[PDB]
Paper text:
[name] (MOKV), as other lyssaviruses—including rabies virus (RABV)—causes deadly encephalitis in mammals. Its envelope [name] G is involved in two successive steps of virus entry: receptor recognition, to allow virion endocytosis, and fusion of viral and endosomal membranes, to release the viral nucleocapsid into the cytoplasm for the subsequent steps of infection. Fusion is triggered by a low pH-driven conformational change of G from its pre-fusion toward its post-fusion conformation. G is also the target of neutralizing antibodies.
Numbering used by the authors: 1 to 109, 118 to 401
Write the structure that this text describes.
């Protein structure tokens, strides 16, 4: 991921240069892993947002029978006594009843004598839609009408789950369970490589993730891998070799993640626009103003250049760029900028990369006062809900 800030490991030489040697950095996260090569490829991730096929459409099926004894009371009365009781359905009956219902027909649906009793016994099955949930980590099928919370059968062969009422069974709408793990999209990403080695990818939004520390995880039949940050994707030759502890969970794929991801990626773009735009006005106004060198800082860790102005001239040195995690790790004192081991003595109020000592003695870094990439980086961290197992226990 992107750091908050970057800072030279050490600063030694400070050689001079002309404004036409100003380079804007390309900020490739994958470079710090040693992979500067980006070839397209295609990977599987969860569908975005709602997963209509983690839910399983089905129907309860209860068997009733209504008896009606129509006796003549001997008063000359004609009296009718009703009894209602239950019975247990067979799966094949329930299916035929359901199919009968989905298309209109005749669905659901007495002589006196003087001295005869008459008993009509009607044997209905009632069919109400009932949705039940599935654990995509491993195909079991949970609901609170099932007696242990878990279906009595198990994917791919569920003729019927057993419910808590001996007279009611649950059948699934599609006895095949053929749609019931279509929860995947195929997206197009850009894989970052070094010859053969695969170090990470940018997903369909442009957001880079590293493969380092990624365990293997099979989700609802498809064997993918779990990326450190928690998200899950499957593609052909992962080079991942450590199965996950079942403790581990993946994350959902909600839309605002994908949205906020895209915000991050246009943020990286806009700093690279703003660096060329600055470097243009630098060469076409032929006036370089120290405030603005801030734009040439290598946003990613790695090797690069650093820039200042002294003795009137403009000048550079070649550095390794440490990741900076907390502002306080480089600003321990007021007025102190921790480069390597000592503070950085500013000459007539300037240090490198546009960092100055303001008139109050404080070390002003422009990125520190407002950075839209950093504010967005936090929202992403906050849109990440882990996809948990079913709660029914
Ligand atoms: C691959 O890694 C080697 C070793 O550091 C490096 O010399 C080479 O430039 C790399 N190739 C890339 C990043 O395409
Ligand atoms: Tb080093
Ligand atoms: Tb009787
Ligand atoms: Tb929104
Ligand atoms: Tb929106
Ligand atoms: Tb331009
Ligand atoms: Tb301080």
């Amino acid at each position: 991921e992107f750091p908050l800030y970057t800072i030279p490991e050490k600063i030694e030489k400070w050689t001079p240069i002309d404004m036409i040697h100003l380079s804007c950095p390309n900020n490739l996260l994958s470079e710090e892993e040693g992979c500067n090569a980006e070839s397209s490829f295609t990977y599987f991730e969860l569908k975005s947002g709602y997963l209509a096929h983690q839910k399983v459409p089905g129907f309860t099926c209860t068997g009733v029978v209504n008896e009606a004894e129509t006796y003549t009371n001997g008063n000359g009365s004609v009296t009718t006594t009703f009894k209602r009781k239950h019975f247990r359905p067979t799966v094949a009956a329930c299916r035929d009843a359901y199919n009968w219902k989905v298309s209109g027909d005749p669905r659901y649906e007495d002589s006196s004598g003087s001295r005869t009793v008459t008993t009509t016994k009607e044997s209905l099955l009632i069919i109400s839609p009932s949705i039940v949930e599935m654990d995509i980590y491993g195909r079991t099928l949970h609901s609170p009408m099932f007696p242990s919370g878990v279906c009595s059968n198990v994917y791919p062969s569920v003729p019927s789950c057993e419910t808590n009422h001996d007279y009611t069974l649950w059948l699934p709408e599609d006895p095949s369970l053929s749609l019931v793990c279509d929860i995947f999209t195929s997206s197009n990403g850009k894989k970052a490589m070094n010859g053969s080695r695969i170090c990470g990818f940018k997903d369909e939004r442009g957001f880079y993730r590293s493969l380092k520390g990624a365990c293997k995880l099979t989700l609802c039949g498809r064997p993918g891998i779990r990326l450190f940050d928690g998200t899950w994707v499957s593609f052909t030759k992962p080079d991942v070799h450590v199965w996950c502890t079942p403790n581990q969970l993946i994350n959902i794929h909600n839309d605002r993640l994908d949205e906020i991801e895209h915000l991050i990626v246009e943020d990286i773009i806009k700093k690279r626009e703003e660096c060329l735009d600055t470097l243009e006005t630098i060469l076409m106004s032929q006036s370089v103003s120290f405030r603005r060198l801030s734009h040439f800082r290598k946003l990613v860790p790695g090797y690069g250049k650093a820039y200042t102005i002294l003795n009137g001239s403009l000048m550079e040195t070649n550095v390794y760029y440490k990741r900076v995690d907390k502002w306080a790790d480089i600003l321990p004192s007021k007025g102190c900028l921790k480069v390597g081991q000592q503070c950085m003595e500013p000459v007539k109020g300037v240090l490198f990369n546009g960092i100055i000592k303001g008139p109050d003695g404080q070390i002003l870094i422009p990125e520190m006062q407002s950075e839209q990439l950093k504010q967005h980086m936090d929202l992403l961290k906050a849109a990440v809900f882990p996809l948990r197992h079913p709660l029914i226990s």
